[PDB]
């Protein structure tokens, strides 16, 4: 039980799919009974993605331990069963923060603190932390080799390879092998120049993963094998694919996992990818099609809703339904009205912060509730569902969240400390990561989850106001799930409706292609049943 | 006045179209009344392409002065009217041969001969020799920047830029800006890394020519401008095109020629590209279509017949005929028979050396003659036409070339020194470049060329045997052209045929898209007339 | 068994003593009973040093086979007993000449000839030719790593290391570790940057030879070991020394030969360096001192007479005489007179071509003969001795060489084809390498060499004119040695003189510190005897 490390780097361009490649390889190794994990080294200065805007860098992924991480850890958890934590993602900012803190504590004993060895040492320590207790650790190095931003990471993993040795370390380098119409051939020259940059900083690649818009032929792979001084079997073709679920099979068919198990002297049975083959089959053979509207305030970058989009796809797989995801700007509902929500088989309102576009989401929730269109609200999607029902059924004029209208008469959503009734009377911070939720008997979610308790992940400040809840309950709304000593509302259901569910937690973070998710499976099923009625 | 130099380099990949880009820019500058020339610096060790196989290198192009050169000089002569010579193309091989000859002789006076300064000095001397006496000299550096083979060339042109100054030198660097489906954007990172390699060898690019399979948008051009420290108008998009004739217009529309004229302080009128607009109009508006079979022994690389393929296209422009060029392996005629010559409106047998596939070409010549299918034979194409007629009409059994069957009874083709009749009685080396040919009255070619004398370019050793010619003439074959004191046969015609012409010279080398060529215009017209008769 | 290769490279500066280091290591390995050889790869374009001036390049060394080579092959033959040939030295010029000859001929079968693989293949072929049939082959790469001139050599030896493997190849890299008064320490940063340049071209050094003006301490060697990823015992201190004969001992004391034998799995006994210890003892314990004047025309670079200077030192070892070598410009004898030849215990006139300074050498030869000062003339030194005697004893007015005065009345020195007497009557090119010489009975050289025949090496065109010889013999000059069928004069002696010898051959090329040389031993002894008589 010596821990093995696969260092995953990228050359020529950034957008090679280093994360998907790492996750896909990890999936093959896990299917051989190996204990595998993945970690992402990000050369950005942000202490963590917590601050990074959804519009700029896509969704903030939440691990069970409540870490705010890169969306790549979503890819990792959708490919392997090993649970991600704070240890599986860190930035240059984190490393510099670590070292600056160690200096304050006096750990360096008045020594001059240097990129080598002190920054490189801090990097190695965090890689070992995240890696130890596993058979194989895949370490994705963000950036493009030759850029200055990743030089400390590359020096750190170079040192690790010398210490640990070539028996228990491999360098897997992704490269672009682009097609030129002029020559009717894919070109290895960019790979030649990228590998030279790698050699210049003291790294010899063991494995070349050749990215192209088509198969990289044996002739070109043999050319790369010779100039890199690696076996031809260590040069892998990874063409553009219509589904990332195919990549594990494509890598296995070229025997990449065999090469890795040989290099690390790992005796394990053949990879059983039957579950991945099933996912590919399901995706390729939908029985019917549905159009589901995702009404949010960050649609300008789809990666803002990465896990929600994948969760809707996984809902399709389990129902053998093709899901047409129509990304709708909630602000367009405010200006152009409810006419742009026509021709939808179901409506999803995802998570978000700030008031911009929220009134459009409240209108969207009302439209879905009144017209019996299947509805799933996530976090902000539950708030607007509660606000809708408060205003338009419970007759709480201008009911809102204190996040949006602090001095509103009916703050149906607010921080626990702000909880007040309509008369301003009172009783007597961000919730992050996994928490147990108690499901109410005879609720739809109790039926779908088939358990009295569930574990789902939070990323929110503002709660359902329990002081104004009973008046909304009396108006017909049903509490389907609660959590903690304060009995905070986790799930609500509108019962006089074919399928209307809204939750505080982020169910998209526990959805996988192989296992699906009870809420998303139920939601897409309801969408198909609605579509058949129309 | 002062001679200006544009050094044309390429990064990321070899196959950027550096020659086409240089030729297209030269076309714009010529259309502004400037005296422009182009030269090609090839990093190969071959003293010249004379030895290099067509299937390895593409066609050997022949200049008027009889130099054997890169096919790029064909691009140059098809875009500008400045005539190419030996001075417009040289290899590393030529430079080392020059320096070794100077050294072993004693020109260096017992000095140590070094890459710097002696190899770089030899390079600069040949660039000056080709350039001086022109307003603008475009110098294409073969290879990809970063490779070791072009480092001496790049050091040479770096020194020239220092000596001459930034007032009369520009660095124009072609780069690949490839599209990634993953990012949905073209990627500048390869340009970033390529420019870094240029800077490391002391070259700052003035102009970036951005190659891609689509337009490089203003936002990406703005990024390249900033990281290269060049004006935005010095960053040019050159997307993949269906027609190279459009490239002059594409570059002019982005003001590339304006920027160059400003940098070199050239006061000249706006480029009138009406001649190129006309070529584009002709090409886009064909009246009819033909299929012309090109039957040869080098079809595995189409660039083996680069100038012939372009000459057929030019023949189409002048007739408003779309030419579908079907490359047919002459060895397939030997094995599968004349079956594979079905559905052709005309047949062209191009040049070649060695006996492999020649019997297939003789069979092809016979097929075209007997079935009244328009035929054009070039060099070897004339040999197989003469052999066909000698064997199958003049009843000269197994008539051949001494190149193929040295001891044959009827050497109808042979070296002048080998000339013998069928009884072995006799009379009492490579022809290269332009030579006057005298056309015979009442010949098809005398009408087509509409002149008593023409100038065409040779690349051949083996002549028509004048000792056996009179017997072939008596059998009905006509001599249509002669040259020199030995009265060597240059053109033959089969009169009892709609269009049957074969020439010793290479007419494809004097064909241009603007001027066309009388022989190819006549050939494609005959192909159109045959197609209509069917 | 399997041939082992040690690739010897240099970084930071050129003048590291790569040749001396290679030769000194080879000496240790030979003293362990191994069959060892050395070869020099020069990045100069000169086909060979035959053209290169002595004042530019240093002496042209001549091997037994008559190859004109780098003076480093003199270092090699003075450290190991393995005889050098044409195979032990080649230039970039030779490689390009080889490849151009192969190309223009037709060995590459119409292929494109490229730096990689064709130039690198030609390099590897010549390394194999020189190396195969030896236990250990030391391959010295001329130039400084990072320079463009040696990139093909470094790529060639990189490929060899991959092909042969790390079991039978080592990279030994010389580096400068310079002392800074400011820091009071030697600096490893230049070694760091040099090794980075090696890594960028795909070479990992196995051994670091650290050059400095003092010992590189264990702490600095430990730093170099870590950043190069080599054992501490693979990092060697080679400080500046007063005697190159000490370097074998210095390297052995640090176990360099032990590390090499271990890496190559050579089981051989410990190096016995007693022969080198004896040379060091002799050198350190002289009994008397002499001043020997070397009067020539290339003294502006002492390396012009490298082997002659070493041969005089070896003459000192055998006699326990400390030799003070005073380099005197022969042109200063022409201007200032024989004043500048005062206080000399002996006079040596070495080889040379052209008339500049020759009259000064004739005056020098006369001075030594008339004043009974021991004289040794080598090649030109023999010519000026013959001319001196012809003019001033045999009364042949203005006697000269045809090289200097072609139409002179008494051409006592001339080409065999030019041989004429004073009346213009006649009888009815460069001699290179080892030739047998027959020594005459009762001659000084017959006693010194203690054999009737000797083998010495030539580099000359102009011979003693046998037509005018008998008259010079009658005047008292003695012929002491002859060669060949033409009975060419090899050695002359002035008998009425304590020690006056002059030879056509270059005896300095067969002198070694261990074996000495009979002629130089006799010369230095005569110098000592003259000094005592004063
Ligand atoms: N470090 C290197 C490696 C290769 N070459 C040169 O690269 C040329 C071949 O380049 P190219 O024609 O672009 O082909 P490939 O290297 O095969 O590249 P690609 O796969 O992109 O076609 C050869 O002449 C060789 O001398 C070089 O100069 N320096
Ligand atoms: N010499 C350089 C230049 C840039 N960067 C880094 O490159 C990153 C951006 O790279 P990428 O995301 O690939 O985008 P672009 O550079 O815009 O490249 P492309 O046009 O290919 O997307 C930045 O974080 C910057 O710190 C670097 O490390 N070293
Ligand atoms: N980028 C360069 C620059 C120079 N050279 C080579 O460097 C050699 C000269 O190096 P060297 O003898 O060390 O002399 P200098 O360069 O003058 O260095 P120094 O001042 O240290 O003596 C020349 O043959 C030249 O071809 C090279 O290969 N690449």
From Swiss-Prot, chains A, B, C:
Cross-referenced PANTHER family: CTP SYNTHASE, CTP SYNTHASE-RELATED
Gene Ontology molecular-function annotations: ATP binding; CTP synthase activity; glutaminase activity; identical protein binding; metal ion binding
Record has Magnesium as a keyword: yes
Protein's UniProt name: CTP synthase
NCBIfam families cross-referenced by the UniProt entry: PRK05380.1, PyrG
Described function: Catalyzes the ATP-dependent amination of UTP to CTP with either L-glutamine or ammonia as the source of nitrogen. Regulates intracellular CTP levels through interactions with the four ribonucleotide triphosphates.
Membership in a protein family: Belongs to the CTP synthase family.
Organism: Escherichia coli O45:K1 (strain S88 / ExPEC)
């Amino acid at each position: 039980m010596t821990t093995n490390y696969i260092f995953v780097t990228g050359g020529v361009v950034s957008s090679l799919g280093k994360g998907i490649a790492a996750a896909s390889l990890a999936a093959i190794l896990e299917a051989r009974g190996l204990n595998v994990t993945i970690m992402k080294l990000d050369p950005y200065i942000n202490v963590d993605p917590g601050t990074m805007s959804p519009i700029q860098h896509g969704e903030v992924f939440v691990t069970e331990d409540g870490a705010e991480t890169d969306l790549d850890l979503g890819h990792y958890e959708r490919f392997i069963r090993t649970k991600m934590s704070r240890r599986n993602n860190f930035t240059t900012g984190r490393i510099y923060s670590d070292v600056l803190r160690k200096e304050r504590r006096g750990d360096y004993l008045g020594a001059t603190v240097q990129v080598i060895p002190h920054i490189t040492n801090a990097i190695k320590e965090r890689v070992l932390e995240g890696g130890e207790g596993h058979d194989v650790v895949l370490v994705e190095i963000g950036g493009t080799v030759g850029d200055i931003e990743s030089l400390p990471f590359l020096e750190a993993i170079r040192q690790m390879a010398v210490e640990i040795g070539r028996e228990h370390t491999l360098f897997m380098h992704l490269t672009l092998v682009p097609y030129m119409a002029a020559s009717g051939e894919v070109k290895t020259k960019p790979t030649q120049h990228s590998v030279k940059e790698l050699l210049s900083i003291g790294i010899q690649p063991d494995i070349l993963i050749c990215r192209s818009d088509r198969a990289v032929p044996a002739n070109e792979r043999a050319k790369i094998a010779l100039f890199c001084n690696v076996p031809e079997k260590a040069v892998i073709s990874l063409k553009d694919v219509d589904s990332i679920y195919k990549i594990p099979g494509l890598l296995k068919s070229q025997g990449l996992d065999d090469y890795i198990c040989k290099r690390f002297s790992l005796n394990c049975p053949e990879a059983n990818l039957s579950e991945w083959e099933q996912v590919i089959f399901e995706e390729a053979n939908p029985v019917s099609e549905v159009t589901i509207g995702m009404v949010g305030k960050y649609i300008e970058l789809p990666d803002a809703y990465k896990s929600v989009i994948e969760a809707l796809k996984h809902g399709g797989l389990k129902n053998r339904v093709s899901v047409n995801i129509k990304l709708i700007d909630s602000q367009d509902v405010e200006t152009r009205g409810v006419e742009i929500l026509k021709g939808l088989d179901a409506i999803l309102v995802p998570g978000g912060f700030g008031y911009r576009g929220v009134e459009g989401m409240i209108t969207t929730a009302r439209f879905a509730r009144e017209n019996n269109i299947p509805y799933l609200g996530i976090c902000l999607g539950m708030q607007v569902a509660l606000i809708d029902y408060a205003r338009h059924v419970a007759n709480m004029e201008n009911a809102n969240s204190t996040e949006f209208v602090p001095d509103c008469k009916y703050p149906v959503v607010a921080l626990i400390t702000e909880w007040r009734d309509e008369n301003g009377n009172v009783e007597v911070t961000m919730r992050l990561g996994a928490q147990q939720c108690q499901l109410v008997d005879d609720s739809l979610v109790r039926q779908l989850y088939n358990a009295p308790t569930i574990v789902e992940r939070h990323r929110h400040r503002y709660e359902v106001n329990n002081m104004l809840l009973k008046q909304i309950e009396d108006a017909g709304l049903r509490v389907a799930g609660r959590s903690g000593d304060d009995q905070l509302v986790e799930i609500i259901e509108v019962p006089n409706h074919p399928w209307f569910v809204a939750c505080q937690f982020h169910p998209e973070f526990t959805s996988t292609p192989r296992d699906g998710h009870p809420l998303f499976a139920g939601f897409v099923k309801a969408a198909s049943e609605f579509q058949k009625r129309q």
